[PDB]
Amino acid sequence: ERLPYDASKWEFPRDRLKLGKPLGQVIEADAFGIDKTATCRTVAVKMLKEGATHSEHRALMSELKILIHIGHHLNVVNLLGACTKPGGPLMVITEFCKFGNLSTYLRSKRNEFVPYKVAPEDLYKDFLTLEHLICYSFQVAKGMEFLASRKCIHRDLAARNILLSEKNVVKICDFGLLPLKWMAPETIFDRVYTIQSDVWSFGVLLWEIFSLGASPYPGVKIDEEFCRRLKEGTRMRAPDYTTPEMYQTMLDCWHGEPSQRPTFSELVEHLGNLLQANAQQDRHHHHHH
Ligand SMILES: COc1cc2nccc(Oc3ccc4c(C(=O)NC5CC5)cccc4c3)c2cc1OC
């Protein structure tokens, strides 16, 4: 809230928005002239319900200022404008990501997956591959490195909070706002949220990605015994689409001591190298077959 609000730069006229169908509250809409292109654009709008508690108002208002303060980054949902002046409801507008959350998307591609491609490639039009999985991981790491470098803590980093746009570009959203499955031990037992606890979560996210949309800790009940084992040191087993290195990155993220966990910067470099390693390998697979 301390943060300022430049209406000149962000305010957008309400009658320039055509509110469409709901998505989640979040609504799909068309905005005319929302950006320089002065064209029509599909956008996602988060708005307050009729007569919302003045608490929900500043809540959504701070959501808008967080976005304005954080700034722009390709891997973080982009703020396009807002309706804050009197005359209608408060609305925060962001770019639209047509494919939705990464989790649901990955689940829908389980029958359309191959670790890598070889000619004839049309046998794999729009197929998910290891490069895709590692690439999504890389992008989210960069987004997190971006948020972290700004003292911003996600608090709920999971696949459902990752959105997918055109050309396999993923974006982080709903930051700084059961979920026990993504919470680090210290967050559960001490209620402590740090950048390092977001790393633990990144670990669960990795698992989601390499399980192609699976729910973490399958078959396990989330009770006292579950939390205890998390403390004892017990960890999920490798997911079905993981590579050896990736599962170790998960384990690293799930280190008991927060300080011993990798930083998002380290993770960006690591996943970056994995991505290249995979590409080289793929070039060979592709060249000899
Ligand atoms: C096709 O399905 C969807 C596509 C979507 N594409 C883009 C954005 C969507 O919802 C969102 C997600 C996060 C925010 C935040 C925000 O992240 N605020 C925190 C930054 C403080 C602030 C303001 C509006 C938002 C709209 C979408 C929702 C969908 O359905 C659920």
186: Cβ below 6 Å to ligand 1? no
Of 44, 75, 96, which marks where a domain is finished? 96
69 in the same domain as 4: yes
Q: Is residue 282 part of a domain?
A: no
Residue nearest to atom 15 of ligand 1 (CA): 174
Which DSSP category does 23 fall into? -
CA 241 to chain CA centroid, nearest Å: 19
124 in the same domain as 19: no
Q: Into how many domains does the chain fold?
A: 2
106 in the same domain as 249: yes
For residues 136 and 52, give the distance between their C-alpha atoms in angstroms, rounded to a whole number. Answer: 36
Residue located via tokens 């729910």: 215
CATH number of the domain that 222 lies in?
A: 1.10.510.10
For residues 25 and 276, give the distance between their C-alpha atoms in angstroms, rounded to a whole number. Answer: 40
182: Cβ below 6 Å to ligand 1? no
187 in the same domain as 45: no
Distance 101 CA to ligand 1 centre (A): 10
23 in the same domain as 50: yes
For residues 175 and 226, give the distance between their C-alpha atoms in angstroms, rounded to a whole number. Answer: 26
In the annotation, is 156 catalytic? yes
Domain with 204 in it: 97-277
* 65, 1 Cβ separation under 8 angstroms: yes
267 in the same domain as 155: yes
157 in the same domain as 18: no
267 in the same domain as 134: yes
258 in the same domain as 122: yes
Q: Is residue 283 part of a domain?
A: no
The tokens for 279 are: 């590409």
125 in the same domain as 10: no
Could you give the angle at the alpha carbon of 107 between the alpha carbons of 104 and 111, nearest 5°? 150
Q: How many of the other CB atoms lie within 10 Å of CB of 13?
A: 15
57 in the same domain as 127: no
175: Cβ below 6 Å to ligand 1? yes
210: Cβ below 6 Å to ligand 1? no
256 in the same domain as 134: yes
Best probe residue, ligand 1, of 63, 163, 164 (max atoms within 8 Å of C-beta): 163
* Resolution as reported, in Å: 2.7
For residues 50 and 47, give the distance between their C-alpha atoms in angstroms, rounded to a whole number. Answer: 9
Of 96, 129, 160, which marks where a domain is finished? 96
For residues 121 and 128, give the distance between their C-alpha atoms in angstroms, rounded to a whole number. Answer: 13
Exposure string for 188-220, b = 16+ CB within 10 A, e = fewer: eeeeebebbbbbbbbbbbbbbbbbbbbebbeee
